[PDB]
Amino acid sequence: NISSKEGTYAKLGGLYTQSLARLVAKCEDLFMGFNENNWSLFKLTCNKPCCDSGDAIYYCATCSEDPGSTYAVKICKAPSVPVHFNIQQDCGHFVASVPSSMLSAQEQDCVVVITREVPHQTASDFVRDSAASHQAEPEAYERRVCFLLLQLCNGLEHLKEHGIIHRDLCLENLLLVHCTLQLPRLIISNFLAPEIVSASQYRKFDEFQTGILIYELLHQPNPFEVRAQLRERDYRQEDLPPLPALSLYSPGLQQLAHLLLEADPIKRIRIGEAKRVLQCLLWGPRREALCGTLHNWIDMKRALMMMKFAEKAVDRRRGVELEDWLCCQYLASAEPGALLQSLKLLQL
Amino acid sequence: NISSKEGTYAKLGGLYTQSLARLVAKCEDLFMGFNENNWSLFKLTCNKPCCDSGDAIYYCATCSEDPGSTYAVKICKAPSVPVHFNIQQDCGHFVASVPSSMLSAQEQDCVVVITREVPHQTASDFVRDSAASHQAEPEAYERRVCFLLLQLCNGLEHLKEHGIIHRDLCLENLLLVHCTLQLPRLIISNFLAPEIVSASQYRKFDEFQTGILIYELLHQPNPFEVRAQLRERDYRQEDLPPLPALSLYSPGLQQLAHLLLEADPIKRIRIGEAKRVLQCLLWGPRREALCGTLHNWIDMKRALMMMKFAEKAVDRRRGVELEDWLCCQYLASAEPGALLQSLKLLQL
């Protein structure tokens, strides 16, 4: 059966799909895997917080029942999910009494949640400290923004699939976690009169907030917080402010923001389409029966991906990174149809 | 340029060749990298020998100048090479006085050579202890024999290229060494009247001895040691004894032995051709402008090889083995021409 050239090479093209799905499965294995009475088992590692997100403050802790691993103690300032890589996992909660010095009269009652992932900083912290870096090296920063946004989309989509809408997404509530075996791991933190806001508009709400976040990540102000015409009039995507063209990602990110900030909650782009767009900005086909051409591109990108992984197996300090995983997720589900969707969403 | 299907897939076919050559280079990195006065630096680990080859006895030792690694002390019973994976590397020598108890009147003067590789056993030891195993599970054993023979060919070829002919190859002088990061690593140990034996016949001598070794590895006697007609007459390959057909490798190994034992030292098969034949027996095309068909086979085998390596990069205890390296060496230099050579040498 190996006599026909393209019969064999069409046979190969299927086995790239095969391995890539297997690679994603194993990569998922790699990067992944209490009550008020059980709190005795815990022990804060130090007196300093590792992260402060306004909504809560974080302290690394160890558990005597679980030696070798570390937990994050989330102390909420306020007076249910299936597991995902980009979603904060709560392991139990209670009410404790905390010295006011730890929250930055002598003590306050706080809700204490036990988190599996220890945050290095928040997204707002990252934005706050990277203005000069964005100015100096725009392409590196804006690519990083696309990676964070991609992870954010993965989390939001997993939340939406199981009936959860985060009523307020903000940079302060997006946790950046260290990740090995550099690009951080993004994690979305947890929180008869009819409703003033319908369930319909809540469905396309994460998309709307994400559009605002794109501005905030690229060191631009919230458009509605600066332009009164956007608060008072029925605007259109043309009315939305632009971004300084500093790199290859700036136009595509501006386009994506406009697509996410469309006033009509029906013609607005879903979160899964935004994901595919970010994917296109990162690895996807650039400007250069078109499906056949795309089929070739997918096959070539898959072969080059398998090549990078194969060379990592024999290199003693090149190893598998989060970027490799995310890139595999894209190429494994890559189809010429969906790529076309994303290409003219980017109006290319 | 990615518009044409087979233009792209012919573009891929070149990049498999690219990576595979790179994989071989890095695999080579992985599996690879004194006087009488310096002997003070050394220290035998224990009182027991780790290997006895008749020609010499081996003792593991440590060096104070080189902590963390182990050396093998080769004590020769007798009263210059470039580096290769299958060739014993001497690091210095001298004459020492050894208690006669260590050689298995109270002491004897022995030549002591410092070896980089610590042997587990010899090939004859392996043959001696595996008769039942060969009887019980023939295919596993005979495949192992092909792997050892392959490594032996790699060593002999590297020796011949640099003007060295091992005047006596025997199973006792072939050292099996442990190898990680199971299939052992084979290592070839070191040693006016005109010459009775010409330089011409010495050129095809390693091939002749290898042919005898094939019989000895498969638990069969040396043909010349059992058949008088072979010692007294000008025999032909038809006169050479057969092997019991116990597995898929038995006919091909018998064929290879006959090819190596051809009486005429000119029509005899070289050591490099025997290598390609063993390669064919292990991974090569089986019985099922034929170059185009072979091109497809090479490309498919390369893609499957890159797949195995890529899946090893994300598997925490599947890792790169010696068999993977040897298989890469074959596929990286695989050409339809040379494969045809081997296929009808196996009279297929």
Describe the protein.
The structure is a homodimer of 348-residue chains. Chain A is of the alpha+beta class and 348 residues long. The first copy, chain A, has 3 domains: 1-33 and 289-348, no CATH class; 34-79 and 90-119, no CATH class; 80-89 and 120-288, no CATH class. Chain A has 12 helices and 9 strands. The two termini of chain A are 41 Å apart. The interface between A and B is large, with 39 and 39 residues. Chains A, B: Residues 34-282 form the Protein kinase domain. Chains A, B: Belongs to the protein kinase superfamily.
Shape of chain A: globular
Task: Give the end-to-end Cα distance of chain A, rounded to a whole number of Å.
Answer: 41 Å
Q: Over the alpha carbons, how many angstroms does the gyration radius of chain A reach?
A: 22 Å
Structural class of chain A: alpha+beta
PDB class: signaling protein
Keywords: kinase, pseudokinase, signaling protein
Assembly: dimeric
Entry title: Crystal structure of Sugen kinase 223
